[PDB]
Amino acid sequence: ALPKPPGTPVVTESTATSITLTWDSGNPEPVSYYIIQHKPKNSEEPYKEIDGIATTRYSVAGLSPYSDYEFRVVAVNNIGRGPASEPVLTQTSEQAPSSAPRDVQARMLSSTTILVQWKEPEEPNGQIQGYRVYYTMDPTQHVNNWMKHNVADSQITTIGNLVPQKTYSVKVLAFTSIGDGPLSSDIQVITLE
């Protein structure tokens, strides 16, 4: 007869871009192979299908970081294709952001304070936990020797105690739990009233 549905698949490995599934055959007799059905959790469209999986374990790659996914497994034998299992829900791991905060802007508020603001990076790869604002009077320095101000998840901050009539270079990165993303390319702001 046709195969019965495989056992509900179990996620046993995950990375930022892959999910590894294992399942029970769900069947008394041997199965020829399996088909994995996968989609984003909140897609309302039909599952995509990976055909011809010859074992009861498979890693689905390259998915995107910090994303919700739905999977099912289908068994096939010589008679044909059985019903899909019950779905499993899961989520790929986070990464550091892989793009810079966008539209980074700064303007003078006084001779000693500026206003810095930006937009969220397009590629956060995770929950943004905060931003780090780098600023200096000498941008030839390594960024780790610039002055630094840490911020929570936000898009605007003020920075004070600046020396008047100076060009300050400013760079901003976002960070997730995993790590720091890239720095925006330098902008300049002058402490001139």
Residue numbers in the entry: 328 to 520
The authors write:
Vertebrate type-IIa RPTPs comprise LAR, PTPσ and PTPδ, which share common domain architecture with a single transmembrane (TM) helix flanked by a large extracellular domain (ECD) and cytoplasmic tandem PTP domains: the membrane-proximal PTP domain (D1) is catalytically active, whereas the membrane-distal PTP domain (D2) is inactive. In mammals, presynaptic type-IIa RPTPs form trans-synaptic adhesion by specifically binding to their cognate postsynaptic organizers through their ECDs for inducing synaptic differentiation of neurons. To date, five different types of postsynaptic organizers for type-IIa RPTPs have been reported: interleukin-1 receptor (IL-1R) accessory protein (IL-1RAcP)7, IL-1RAcP-like-1 (IL1RAPL1)8, neurotrophin receptor tyrosine kinase C (TrkC), netrin-G ligand-3 (NGL-3)1011 and Slit- and Trk-like (Slitrk) family proteins. To elucidate the structural basis for decoding the ‘splice-insert signaling code' in the type-IIa RPTPs, we determined the crystal structures of PTPδ-ECD in complex with IL-1RAcP-ECD and IL1RAPL1-ECD.
The following Fn1 and Fn2 domains are aligned in a straight line, similarly to the isolated PTPδ Fn1-Fn2 structure, which we determined at 2.0 Å resolution.
